[PDB]
Amino acid sequence: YKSVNITFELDERIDKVLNEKCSAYTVELGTEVNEFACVVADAVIKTLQPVSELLTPLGIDLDEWSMATYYLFDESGEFKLASHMYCSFYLEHHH
Numbered sequence: 001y002k003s004v005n006i007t008f009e010l011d012e013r014i015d016k017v018l019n020e021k022c023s024a025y026t027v028e029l030g031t032e033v034n035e036f037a038c039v040v041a042d043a044v045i046k047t048l049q050p051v052s053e054l055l056t057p058l059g060i061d062l063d064e065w066s067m068a069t070y071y072l073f074d075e076s077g078e079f080k081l082a083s084h085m086y087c088s089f090y091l092e093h094h095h
Contacts, residue, residue, distance in 0.1 A: 003027075005084050008086075010087065014058070022046075033072050045065065068089055070088075073088065
């Protein structure tokens with residue numbers, strides 16, 4: 001297995017909550033990064049479900065977040081599992 005800690009860069013209004021509440025994962029080695037990204041996406045949506053109505057005034061549409069693909073990057077900017085990864089809605093990331 002690989003223990004992974006995620007730094008979320010999805011929306012500055014909520015990233016600190018995600019970093020505290022749903023940042024730690026254990027991933028079987030050989031899991032593809034896009035499969036792991038679905039696990040992270042599940043945790044983000046599960047974490048934010050109780051506040052979906054409260055997030056709309058903050059500019060966050062949880063329905064849209066539930067449809068988007070989440071992208072995970074190591075500190076080299078690659079789609080490769082690592083002890084520390086970044087989660088973004090964008091297709092590139094700069095550590």
